[PDB]
Design a protein around this nucleic acid. Structure first.
Ligand SMILES: Nc1ncnc2c1ncn2[C@@H]1O[C@H](COP(=O)(O)O)[C@@H](O)[C@H]1O
Ligand SMILES: [K+]
Ligand code: NA
Ligand SMILES: [Zn+2]
Length: 180
DNA sequence: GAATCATAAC
């Protein structure tokens, strides 16, 4: 297939679709995640093309902080009266091209969350806190990721709220209900 | 049988 039409370039198309955009300014766009892994799941992307956190440098520090600020504003505007917790962050190893910040509610109540990989990508060190990434860029000048990230995706299912170990995704989804 | 493991997508 073509480069432009490859599955990995999908965000570059979605970020330009008015029906997916929930906020725009001079620097960033916010879209709904197409396969949300919780009740609220947005992606914040800069208009400027940066392939991944591997290409981030100190020139991008203000932009990374701006993406975070916008993420927090979207939470207020769209889910302010919600009693939900949110996290903002980046997958240690992304799949989709173009840097994008995850803004996701912590219920993890969604049909699109289907496997151990989905769970661990948001609930282990594989999920890099937005603030941590920002501070690493500020102090070290670039983002580095330690070895062993793919292995984290295979860890036994463990609830993010109470640390209980669950034997399956259906049982985990059931268990999560108690933290509503 | 239900659910997960890994592989494949030309
Ligand atoms: N065409 C698309 N539009 C919006 N979000 C997408 C699209 N394709 C995949 N996603 C989401 O983008 C994220 C990509 O994961 P990652 O590359 O690990 O950050 C996942 O949360 C997907 O559900
Ligand atoms: K198995
Ligand atoms: Na991947
Ligand atoms: Zn729990």
């Amino acid at each position: 297939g073509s480069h432009m039409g490859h599955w990995s370039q999908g965000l570059k198309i979605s970020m330009q679709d008015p029906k997916m955009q929930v906020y725009k300014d001079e620097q960033v766009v916010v879209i709904k995640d197409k396969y949300p892994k919780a009740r609220y799941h947005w992606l914040v992307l800069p208009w400027t093309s940066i392939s991944s956190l591997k290409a981030v440098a100190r020139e991008h520090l203000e932009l990374l902080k701006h993406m975070h600020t916008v993420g927090e504003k979207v939470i207020v505007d769209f889910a302010g009266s919600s009693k939900l917790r949110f996290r903002l962050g980046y997958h240690a190893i992304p799949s989709m091209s173009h840097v994008h910040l995850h803004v996701i509610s912590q219920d993890f109540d969604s049909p699109c969350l289907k496997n151990k990989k989905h769970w661990n990508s948001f609930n282990t060190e594989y999920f890099l806190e937005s603030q941590a990434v920002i501070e690493m860029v500020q102090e070290a000048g670039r983002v580095t990721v330690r070895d062993g990230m793919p292995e984290l995706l295979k860890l036994p299912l463990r609830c993010h709220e109470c640390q209980q170990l669950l034997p399956s995704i259906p049982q985990l989804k059931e268990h999560l209900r108690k933290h509503w």
